[PDB]
């Protein structure tokens, strides 16, 4: 349950460490992004010699949320933090080469198959 | 809305209500009949009759529970020594309410509540 101004950790090695959502994409007045949703972000903190710089504006896909995801039997999966994976602003392909922490099967689609394949665990 | 809720607020806070029913339960046990407002009488049933049900089984633990709920040793002794045995074979309904008109000062609807075998 991510909205404008929500700060997120980064589940890749793109170099970003903290990013801020600046837009929930995909509809007028759309309030929230959850797992598997694409957002617009600004980079608020990055490591020195990484692939991205502080202040950059780009896209990301939410891969973990504190609110969590519900499954068809009523069950829930919740995480301790909110985290996303940075995407190239035009191609919407991942910028990093490694994925950190578990992701969920909600990413199992043609769009995020690279993330699914790189993740250490898929719940 | 108050859908399915139980209990009367009686234009008091929770601590006042709890204290007032502790006192009024003591008075009903002591005197075996009292006069009060009809709504208070209806509420007092839910306090007094579980105390009698408790007094049906005499034990140290139950006397301590009854003391916790009444804070009056004379009332606890009367409960366990007299009322419990008097009602040992009655399945609830230890009190009866009898409506008796309206108070002079404030036109409040009034009722007597008594132990059934008084």
């Amino acid at each position: 349950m991510i909205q404008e101004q929500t700060m997120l950790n980064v589940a890749d090695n793109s170099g970003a460490r903290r990013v801020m959502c600046i837009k929930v994409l995909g509809g007028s007045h759309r309030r929230y992004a959850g797992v598997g949703d694409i957002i617009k972000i600004t980079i608020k903190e990055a490591i020195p010699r990484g692939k991205v710089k502080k202040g950059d504006v780009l896209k990301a896909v939410v891969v973990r949320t504190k609110k969590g995801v519900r499954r068809p039997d009523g069950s829930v999966i919740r995480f301790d933090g909110n985290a996303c994976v940075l995407l190239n602003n035009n191609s919407e392909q991942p910028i990093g080469t490694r994925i950190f922490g578990p992701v969920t099967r909600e990413l199992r689609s043609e769009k995020f198959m690279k993330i699914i394949s790189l993740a250490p665990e898929v719940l | 809305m108050r859908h399915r809720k139980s209990g009367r607020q009686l234009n008091r806070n929770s601590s006042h209500r709890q204290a007032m029913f502790r006192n009024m339960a003591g008075s009903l046990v002591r005197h075996e009949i009292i006069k009060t407002t009809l709504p208070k009488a209806k509420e007092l049933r839910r306090v007094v009759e579980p105390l009698i049900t408790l007094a049906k089984t005499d034990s140290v633990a139950n006397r301590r529970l009854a003391f916790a709920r009444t804070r009056d040793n004379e009332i606890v002794a009367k409960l366990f020594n007299e009322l419990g045995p008097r009602f040992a074979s009655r399945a609830g309904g230890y009190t009866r309410i009898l409506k008796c008109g309206f108070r002079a000062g404030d036109n409040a609807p009034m009722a007597y509540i008594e132990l059934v075998d008084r």
Binding site: P72, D73, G74 | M1, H3
Partner: protein, 209 residues
């Protein structure tokens, strides 16, 4: 297609083998008993009147009892009419069971929604509250303006304001029929329907389908 009168027993879930939980409303549909058939010649329209359930005799008045006795059926808890389609025929005293829905895929369910009493505009009409702070004086859930000025110098009909909410007839359309259990007089539909537990429901084959 006629419908049937039932009772909202409550909600539960049906787990399927492939791991899906389906939330369901359990509707008890006892036999509906035809008490009157209306036709063009006498009534100017085609319908059946049905009863269901049971009623106590000392609460059944003599006019009601005479009506039931003419039908030849035991008194139920009320009477409900269903309009008849062109090919539908029924006879007085016939029993109609929940097996009527055996091959129906979706239903419309009508009930009396739960009663909220007098409701404000925030809850009744989804109005926005005004500031909690920033200087607001006594106006945090109040409606705001209710019109313009000298033109038109009045408040328009249908203005959204506070008032009674709920406790009114509501239809929910096109609910999946999950199970028809004629032996237990049960209809299971997917999702919620109007009304409190215990309330009467009218169930019909869906009009949109």
């Amino acid at each position: 297609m006629i419908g049937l009168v039932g009772k909202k027993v409550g909600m539960t879930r049906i787990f399927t083998e492939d791991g899906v939980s389906i939330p369901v409303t359990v509707i008890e549909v006892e036999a509906n008993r035809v008490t009157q058939v209306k036709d063009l010649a006498n009534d100017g329209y085609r319908a059946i009147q049905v009863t269901t359930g049971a009623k106590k005799a000392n609460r059944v008045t003599k006019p009601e009892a005479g009506h039931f006795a003419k039908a030849g059926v035991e008194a139920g808890r009320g009477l409900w009419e269903f309009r008849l389609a062109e090919g539908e025929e029924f006879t007085v005293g016939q029993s109609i069971s929940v097996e009527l829905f055996a091959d129906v895929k979706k239903v419309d369910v009508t009930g009396t929604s739960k009663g909220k009493g007098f409701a404000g505009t925030v809850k009744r009409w989804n109005f926005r509250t005004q500031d909690a702070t920033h200087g607001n004086s006594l106006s945090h859930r109040v409606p705001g303006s209710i019109g313009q000025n000298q033109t038109p110098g009045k408040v328009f009909k249908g203005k959204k304001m506070a008032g009674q909410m709920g406790n009114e007839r509501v239809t929910v359309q096109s609910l999946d029929v999950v199970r028809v259990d004629a032996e237990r007089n049960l209809l299971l539909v997917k999702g919620a329907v109007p009304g409190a537990t215990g309330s009467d429901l009218i169930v019909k084959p869906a009009v949109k389908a």
